[PDB]
């Protein structure tokens, strides 16, 4: 805090004054060896006390219930024990040359301990870094409907957090996705689509081949006069498949709107018109067929 | 413990006094070389003895049966041997320059040994860190029904531990899930859902197409008058699929309640009404169909 | 052993006496340079000899046949050669500066050799650490029937070892599972279940819809009067599926007992009662159905 | 900026002058110890202040809204706190030998922290490096239709960014692909194709074998006279499969054009001609067949 | 060898004598600087020559054909070149500061070269370590039939080597399994089974339900009187499944023997008795069934 | 370039002359401390300027448009900024002992920065190294048709680059394969085949068994007289399978040619001859069969 910053500045000024006083004492009349070690140790202890006071104030800050009241008594005690152990270990590690006769040994111990700690914390660190990356550059926005072809994250984005992203699925169920997933998979955004697509297949019986041609023309004509079909996009109607029991004609077009209900209504209208056209020309749809040889 | 802390403080004061006495002896009349090494070794031995006493008290604390009585005699002996070997190795490593004439060699040995130990313990460390993370930020709570699309962890959360999470499945069988899984997979929380979804498909016979339209209207009308259907959510009834042997009409709506029994009752009532409506208009459902050509 | 510990203590006392004698000789009248190198080398050789004697005694301990008699002659010779080579390499690396005038090269070689050895031994180290963890915290116990949805480890736990767990499968075949698997997969414990679950589906013919409703009621009534059904658990009987050739009614309940035979008997009794109820109301079960159009 | 560069050059000149003045003071009449440390500390503080001013100017540059206005107030505060902590930690670590009595300990701490940070940031770093590689050497270009057999990235390339690539799918939906994927998967570019391929199978009835031969010839003749078929490419028409209920004849050719509509039209024309040829010779297509033995 | 060991001991004694002579020369009248470098270099060269002689003797030992005659001439030449290069590189790196004026550079080069070499040799090292593990603790023995649910290693163990295990499959084909696989997969040992299991399902037609009950009883009675059935193991006969076209009755029992032939004979006898019992009560087995609706 | 090399040689000569002059000044009458630092700094600055001039000439070489004109203005600016930043960072790190008062701190900073950079660049480095390996030893050649059983890389090799390999697929579509894939997957080369294989199965009706034998003989005779069948390769015709509705006879032979068209023609001729032989002996092919039991 600001008071903590002022205390740290005062401690730094006091440390500088102590160093200057030690230098002056050495220059004029040195006592003990140089007696700089005692002053340095006192300054380090004062800095550690100031840091501990600032940490306690942060713990006793407006958060308060975050560790004290929100968590269970035993759980809070365990968490406090862990954080105290960690902070005292850090304080021992960073400045211990006065009390370290080994110097290199505890240095190596701290180094390899931090190494294993980092290798273990890799996943949480990756989630945090991916959260920062999403903060800076993100492919979506709140309220956008997104999905991925690699995983199952379909839904509408509801909230973006520091660790996980909350998405409202299509059955009104919250889903929490780790942020790191957004750095290794392809993300698709149907919420920013420009048109909806109508694709279908018409299966005609094998003895209607002589009609197939004209039928296709008729269908195309309808797709060129429907007011709900975008004429500037792809529009293909062709016979392109010998199916097992039928001849298949593809239908591939786009609608002018992107909203769900009118898209479905246009699809239904197109399907009904297709049925009427097919039945009007004397052809008919094909059920699965078989040839049976009886004894 | 508090007594252990007091003993450690007394040992630190004694070490400081020994260092001051060594400095005074050097200043006045030095003996041997400086004779600081004997005092430092004695202080280190005293600190090690105090630490061993504290560790024994912790072992002989109220836990007692945790290592002594709970485990088997041979298993307890093996565990005690392992922990003794580890603690003596640590004590040798951290402070051994007095007895180390190699310095570099044993420090390198300790470093690479800690390296392999950390690489091996990676999984347990990850589980512990994920447990801490779940303690701080977790997507669920005790009593919530959760599931994931990546793994099989379906059930209701019963307990959250330091290493694993205990979940009661839907067949009354406990399931233990490692904590690390919660840092790499998507977690869905149906227990926080707002509505239940009713989705179904009506398959009508092919020669019923001329009626399909009006039937859809009727169905929609019913879904607009049912008192158990949420009118503020999605409500879609459209014909949108040419199936192999039928025309498919989708039904997609939501219920006002989230409880299991009333949701199932509403679904059954809706299905019965749909059957009545379909049969009332002269149409009928379609079985799988085939066309047979006999010789 | 205790004799080995006494020998080590005597060697440490002798080393301390040798160091004190070297210091006294230096103080009074130094010979050669300090002649501390010869004394230190002799002390190191004595310590190495004591360690080798202790290792030989451990090899020649009550185990004896573990390496000597149990293994084959050539295999035992190879194992002894390997362990001797490793022991001498360790003795070289831990204390060699009296012979090392290269120091840096040999320490680098030892470090990177231990590094590759650690990466190679990773798997065995992980198994041992997981065994220790299972010793401290384990989700199961001897005699418990366990299974996992990720791997195939179904069976009853028979023994827990330092490296692997032995499980008796349901066809009376032992199965050995590495311990590390228990630190990365979800473990389910059906042996601690509280109730057994009865779930089934009744498929009625399509023209039986007018009866379906009342039939459901009847079934529910039976499930409310069966003395072998737990009335405090979930009990659902509803029509909730339009199948391909039938209407599906779900049945979902729990039994009071957990033993296999009575659970199966109760399931059979419930199934027979369901059949009787269904046939009594004039309905019938539905075979797979089809509609055939002949030429 | 240019002003920042001029300030840095002035600071470097001032540091050189301070070093020269310290050397001259030492040569003529040294004060304190050498009093070079104060000048070096002042120069370092000035350099740090200049760097902080340049960073603030960059933050307050034309971007402005990038961190200040574009992001949320709490999010912007968190980001500013994070970047401030990081930059002050960097300034502490790069030059701290004046204030570091331990030197080695903080060196090890910074090294291990940077190590874990790098292992965490691996993914973002890989994406950035793959973006650079795509900038230099890339297999596609803007507007090209691409696809991969390993993942689902089918679509037309729309934009290439520093981190992700934006591709317009065939249903007018944007898709964002991480750049790293382009360094480990095979990328196919149909947008640079030279011809379109027509492949199909003709299934004739089993008692039509006596005709099969001549039919093949006829088909080949047609494929040698169609003006839309590339005669310089592969052209194969052969009977090469005993199917379950038919004899299969392969058709394999290429079209002269690459555009979608004319390719589909040519395929339809070829299929109609094939049907006419097959029916003209007295043969017929084969439905799935079966032999039934009645009781 | 023993002669090599004697030569090494003589070389060590000579090196100690050379060091003592150098110390005496320095004490009495030093020549050149100390002239210890020439003596140390000569001792190192002698040690290297002795090691090379021992290595050549090992190469020219009773193995002989292992490298010389067994391998091809070009292959043997390549192998000898590789081993000589490695030997000379080791001799350079282990002790080279007399000729190394860089010291740090060559040690860094050796360290990172060993690092890459170890990372590459990881797999072979893992196989060797798993071989040692199997030597000490192994779940099977020679002649045991083993299998795994994770991989395909089914067969009878024939030989255990330092690197791989040779297993005779059930079609008399040798199979070589790397040892490392035995440290990460579950190993099942059917060769140590105690009983063989008989499991089957009886499918009765739907209109035999009124008989099902008594039929089950009859079957159970037979299973309680068969002399080849273990009465102390599990024995379950119940109706527990509504199949698509039948009612399913489970049969689950164990045989007293474990050998293949009598187990198969008992299974056949039980099946024949089951058929006789089923046909005696008027019921019959059910073929797949269907309901056909003709136009 | 050659001019750059001459400039570098001149700079090296100037640096040697400066060192000699500094040594001579120290020997005769030293100024300042030794005043060798200024000369070394000037030489380093001159070397850096020469290197920068050479780099600018390489940028302004015949490539020119590679960075300047080919890329977009903003993209080129970003790339130039990145490369300049990297160059200045390298120049700072390689020689900074004059300006480094910390020496070790920025040393570890650069070390761990290079560590993360290498871990990120791993993939591109692997692709480059695999390209070099393919340059030296490669299993294919330009124009060869290759495929793999692990991935989908089927096609004919068209170009081999430093990073990716361009392969023309069988539908005239280019495909770019990363080079690293060629170091971990099996590569098959059908372009170097020696013969084409004809394999098929003849399914005869069940009541044709009395003929099967002689039929096989007939078929074999034909395969021994066909001029397009390689008689020196495998030639097997045997009845070896009880199919569901037929008896299966295998046919397995090789053709003398490897070209596509003649291989297909020979296969068609063999199939027609097989049909004629089968129908000549009174047997017939078998459709899928079934037995129906009517009520």
């Amino acid at each position: 805090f600001l008071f903590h910053a002022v205390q740290f500045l005062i401690y730094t000024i006091i440390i500088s004054a102590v160093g200057s006083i030690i230098n002056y004492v050495i220059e004029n009349y040195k006592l003990k060896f140089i007696t700089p070690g005692v002053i340095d140790f006192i300054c380090t202890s004062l800095i550690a006390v100031i840091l501990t006071i600032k940490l306690f104030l942060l713990i006793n800050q407006f958060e308060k219930q975050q560790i004290k009241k929100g968590r269970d008594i035993t759980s809070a005690r365990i968490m406090s024990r862990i954080i105290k152990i960690t902070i005292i270990v850090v304080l021992v590690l960073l400045y211990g040359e006065h009390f370290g006769m080994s110097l290199s040994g505890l240095l190596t111990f701290g180094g390899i301990g931090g190494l294993v700690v980092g290798m273990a914390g890799k996943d949480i660190l990756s989630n945090f870094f991916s959260g920062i990356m999403l903060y800076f550059d993100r492919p979506f926005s709140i309220g956008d409907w997104i999905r991925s072809p690699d995983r199952n994250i379909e839904g509408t984005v509801a909230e973006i957090g520091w660790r996980i992203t909350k998405i409202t699925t299509f059955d009104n169920r919250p889903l929490y996705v780790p942020n790191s997933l957004f750095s290794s998979i392809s993300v698709e955004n149907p919420g920013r689509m420009t048109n909806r697509r109508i694709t279908t297949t018409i299966g005609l019986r094998y003895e209607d081949a002589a009609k197939v041609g004209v039928i296709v023309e008729a269908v195309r004509e309808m797709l060129k006069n429907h007011p709900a079909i975008d004429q500037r996009q792809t529009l293909l109607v062709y016979f392109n498949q010998f199916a097992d029991s039928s001849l298949n004609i593809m239908v591939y077009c786009f609608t002018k709107t992107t909203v769900w209900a009118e898209w479905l209504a246009a699809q239904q209208d197109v399907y009904l018109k297709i049925i009427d056209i097919v039945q009007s020309h004397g052809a008919d749809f094909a059920f699965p067929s078989q040839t049976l040889y009886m004894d």
Side-chain angles (χ1 to χ4, degrees), chain A residues 94 96 108 111 128 147 220 222 230 246 257:
Chain A
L94 39 64
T108 306
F128 183 44
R147 54 169 307 262
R220 196 180 293 129
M222 176 264 294
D230 207 3
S246 58
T257 179

Side-chain angles (χ1 to χ4, degrees), chain A residues 275-289:
Chain A
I275 282 182
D276 190 338
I277 283 176
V278 157
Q279 307 240 78
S280 146
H281 272 84
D284 196 350
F285 297 85
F287 294 113
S289 308

Side-chain angles (χ1 to χ4, degrees), chain A residues 151-205:
Chain A
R151 312 272 292 256
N152 186 3
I153 62 167
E154 187 128 5
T156 84
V157 178
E159 235 167 35
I160 307 166
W162 73 266
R163 193 183 73 83
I164 56 175
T165 303
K166 167 150 126 73
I167 295 175
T168 299
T169 59
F170 277 114
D171 37 3
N172 296 5
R173 297 175 176 184
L175 170 72
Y176 306 93
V177 183
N179 277 341
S180 53
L181 297 195
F182 291 106
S183 85
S184 60
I185 74 175
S186 320
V187 169
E188 188 208 347
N189 195 324
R192 282 185 233 210
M193 87 209 296
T194 65
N195 294 74
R196 296 252 190 183
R197 191 174 66 174
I198 294 183
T199 57
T200 176
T201 298
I202 310 170
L204 303 185
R205 291 166 330 184

